[PDB]
Amino acid sequence: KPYPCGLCNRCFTRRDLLIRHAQKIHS
Ligand SMILES: [Zn+2]
């Protein structure tokens, strides 16, 4: 899989978790 977040300096596991991370913290 695929999922770097650009708001908090990161790399990742599930998709749904990145969506719930930005859609729960950033916007
Ligand atoms: Zn973040």
Residue numbers in the entry: 1 to 27
Direct quotes from the study:
To confirm that ADR1a folds inside the exit tunnel, we sought to visualize it in the ribosome at tether length L = Lmax (i.e., at the top of the fFL profile) by cryo-EM. Because, with the relatively weak SecM AP from E. coli, fFL ≈ 1 at L = Lmax, stably stalled ribosome-ADR1a-SecM complexes of this kind cannot be isolated. We therefore introduced the previously described strongly stalling SecM (Ms-Sup1) AP (Ismail et al., 2012) instead. Parts of the SecM AP can be seen in the exit tunnel, as well as the P-site tRNA. Strikingly, an extra density, not present in empty ribosomes, is clearly visible in the exit tunnel, ∼60 Å from the tRNA. The ADR1a domain is lodged between ribosomal proteins uL22 and uL23 and ribosomal rRNA helices H23, H24, and H50 and is located a few angstroms deeper in the exit tunnel in the cryo-EM reconstruction than in the ensemble of folded structures seen in the 140 K molecular dynamics trajectory (bottom, arrow). The ADR1a snapshot structure (gold) from the 140 K simulation ensemble that best fits the cryo-EM reconstruction (red) in the exit tunnel is shown in Figure 3C. Using this approach, we show that the small zinc-finger domain ADR1a folds cotranslationally as the tether connecting it to the ribosome grows in length from ∼20 to ∼30 residues. Both coarse-grained molecular dynamics simulation and cryo-EM visualization of ribosome-bound ADR1a at a tether length corresponding to the midpoint of the folding transition show ADR1a buried deep in the vestibule of the exit tunnel, providing a clear demonstration that small proteins or protein domains can fold within the ribosome, as predicted by computational studies (O’Brien et al., 2010, 2011). We conclude that ribosomal stalling on the SecM AP is prevented when ADR1a folds and that, as it takes about 30 residues of extended nascent chain to span the ∼100 Å from the P-site to the tunnel exit (Bhushan et al., 2011), ADR1a folds inside the exit tunnel.
